[PDB]
Write a protein that binds this ligand. Structure first.
Ligand SMILES: Nc1nc2c(ncn2[C@@H]2O[C@@H]3COP(=O)(O)O[C@H]4[C@@H](O)[C@H](n5cnc6c(=O)[nH]c(N)nc65)O[C@@H]4COP(=O)(O)O[C@H]3[C@H]2O)c(=O)[nH]1
Ligand SMILES: Nc1nc2c(ncn2[C@@H]2O[C@@H]3COP(=O)(O)O[C@H]4[C@@H](O)[C@H](n5cnc6c(=O)[nH]c(N)nc65)O[C@@H]4COP(=O)(O)O[C@H]3[C@H]2O)c(=O)[nH]1
Ligand SMILES: [Mg+2]
Length: 301
């Protein structure tokens, strides 16, 4: 395992962050062994995305096996961020603090509320948790530009965004810009939907309709490497990411994901990523209108 500053904290996080999310086929002992295997492969950053009693017991026990200060524990909190309130903080005392046997969270990661502001009562409660040294930072998950009024909030120390070799320019730039302004950046979706083929399949993300995937055929035809392993290896070279989020269900999946950290991308790949992005942007150019006359016609409905 390699480690990286979770910037401006002096806390080092593993380049892999293991996500634990509800899974009814696992018991306490399985979650416990899942985290023991992570811990043995040098993973020290976890994101709990779930409140199944089985998961909190098992994760709880395994975290206890080592000293709290060696761990970076993020609690993922979903839902319309505009409807968070005291009920949220109650749920959080029960699940995240009592459930996991913790007296601080390194990070609480909420959804982008698409607003400069968080609800009064919730922000007050976070301020209280921080005064009590129970919450080191608030993080925001986004697929777009977070309101600068929110980023300027003293509470907000981190952002979570998808980054993968499908990622546009606008994305690549948002996360370097964030990281150069001393926000930690967690990388999501290293192995995105667009780059899997040989069912149903949802496409409800505002970034989805605009998405080239021509040129990634080398993902399949690289001797000694799976497409998943290349996509991850690539995310691990982006210097603006504090860490890359991964999800894994069994020991050998953890071990294989850890292996990728210490292997380097195959020899020709960086070159081919350029070939594919240079074709991506010859197509976005060759399929563009004059940006004035376009916008000006659009105005005149
Ligand atoms: N382009 C695209 N890909 C899609 C879409 N829906 C699912 N995928 C792909 O399928 C994975 C798992 O989807 P899931 O089962 O909902 O699993 C998701 C879901 O349970 C949750 N999640 C992620 N984003 C959102 C979100 O905006 N809202 C909600 N409510 N849950 C989300 O986190 C899990 C992991 O997200 P990922 O790690 O990215 O992994 C996602 C992503 O790779 C979509 O509309 N567009
Ligand atoms: N189950 C599932 N649903 C998905 C997934 N991807 C997108 N969606 C759905 O699509 C809606 C809009 O997603 P977006 O356009 O990325 O817009 C998202 C995005 O910018 C942000 N967001 C929410 N969850 C996440 C997350 O896990 N990671 C990041 N990076 N942004 C998130 O909040 C916006 C609104 O989130 P929602 O209201 O949840 O609404 C989400 C959710 O209902 C997925 O993988 N799984
Ligand atoms: Mg701030």
């Amino acid at each position: 395992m390699r480690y990286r500053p979770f910037g401006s904290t002096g806390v080092a996080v593993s380049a892999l962050t293991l996500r634990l999310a509800d899974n009814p086929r696992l018991r306490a002992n399985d979650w416990r062994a899942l985290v023991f295997t992570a811990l043995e492969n040098g993973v020290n950053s976890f994101q709990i995305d779930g409140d199944a009693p089985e998961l909190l017991k098992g994760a709880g026990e395994a975290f206890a096996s080592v000293e709290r200060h060696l761990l970076f524990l993020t609690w993922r909190l979903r839902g319309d961020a505009k409807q968070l309130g005291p009920h949220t903080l109650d749920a959080l005392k029960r699940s995240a603090f009592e459930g996991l046997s913790l007296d601080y969270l390194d990070l609480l990661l909420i959804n982008d509320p698409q607003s400069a502001s968080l609800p009064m009562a919730f922000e007050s409660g976070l301020q209280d948790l921080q005064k009590g040294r129970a919450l080191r930072g608030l993080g925001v998950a986004s697929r777009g530009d977070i309101d600068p009024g929110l980023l300027a909030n003293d509470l907000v120390t981190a952002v979570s965004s998808p980054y993968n070799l499908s990622s546009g320019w606008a994305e690549r730039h948002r996360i370097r810009q964030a990281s150069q302004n001393n926000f930690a950046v967690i990388g999501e979706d290293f192995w995105p939907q667009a780059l899997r083929e040989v069912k149903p399949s949802f496409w409800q993300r505002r970034t989805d309709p605009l998405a080239d995937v021509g040129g990634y055929e080398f993902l399949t035809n690289t001797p000694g490497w799976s497409a998943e392993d290349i996509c991850l290896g690539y995310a691990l070279t982006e210097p603006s990411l504090a860490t890359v989020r991964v999800t894994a269900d069994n020991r050998q999946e953890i071990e294989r994901l850890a292996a990728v950290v210490e292997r380097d991308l195959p020899t020709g790949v960086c070159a081919q990523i350029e070939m594919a992005r240079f074709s991506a942007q010859e197509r976005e150019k060759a399929a563009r209108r004059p940006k004035l006359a376009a916008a000006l016609e659009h105005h005149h409905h």
